[PDB]
Copies of this chain bind each other. A is one copy, B any other.
C-alpha cells in the first residue's frame, strides 16, 4: 500500500512510521513546511502507526532527540515514539479489509487528517487546538498535551484491568476530537476500508 505523508504545518516536522518492532519503509524523515513523503507499506501490515515529531536535532548519523514523539533518539524510527503524539493507526489486509483510525490515547502533539486516496471509505481527522486548550495538569513542557495515563499512571486512566470508564481527561480529548479514540475502551472510531486501499496523512490539515 502507498501512504503519502504531507506536512501542511508552518513548521518543520519529523515524520515517523513504525510497526513497533520494525521501521515501516525508512521509518522517519524530515518534512519541511509543504513537503510530502511517499512511503510503501507491505500488505498484511498490522499495528502500524504514523506520527509527527517536533523540535528535533539530529547529527550526521541520524541520532538525536525530539521534544515530542522521540523514538529512542533515532531519525529512522524502529519503535514507537514517546508521548505526546497524535497517532494515525492502521492494520492492512485483515480478512479482506483495511482498518484505520486516529488516536489521542497517547496524547496529542500535531493536528492531523488521515484519509484514503482510493475509493471505498471516508477519512477521519483531529484538527482542534488541543494543545492551546489543554488542561494544565496534562500540558507537556516540551510541547503537546499528554494523555492522563502517561501523566498519572493509574489503572483507571491506563485501563489496566480491562475495565475503565471515561474520565474528566478523556472527555476533554473527545469533546475537541470526537472522531479520535480518547481512552482505551472508547466506542470505536475505526474506519473500515477495502483491502489494499491507499492513503494520505496530512499534518495541520486546516490551511
Contacts and interface: CB of A to CB of B under 8 A. Distances in A.
Contact of A142 (B57, B68, B142, B153): B153
A153 B64 contact: no
Given A57-B155, A70-B153, A64 B160 contact: yes
Classify chain A's interface size: 20 to 34
Contact of A65 (B59, B66, B67, B153): B153
B66 A153 contact: yes
A10 interface: no
Interface string A65-89: 1111010010000000000000000
Interface string A42-80: 000000000000000101000111111010010000000
A154 B57 CA distance: 9
Contact residues of A: prevailing secondary structure: mixed
A65 B155 contact: yes
Contacts of A63: 160
A11 interface: no
Contacts of A64: 155, 160
Interface in A126-158: 137, 141-142, 151-155, 158
A161 B70 contact: no
B160 A152 contact: no
Interface of A: 57, 59, 63-68, 70, 73, 137, 141-142, 151-155, 158, 160-161
Closest 3 pairs (CB-CB, A-B)? A142-B153, A67-B153, A65-B160
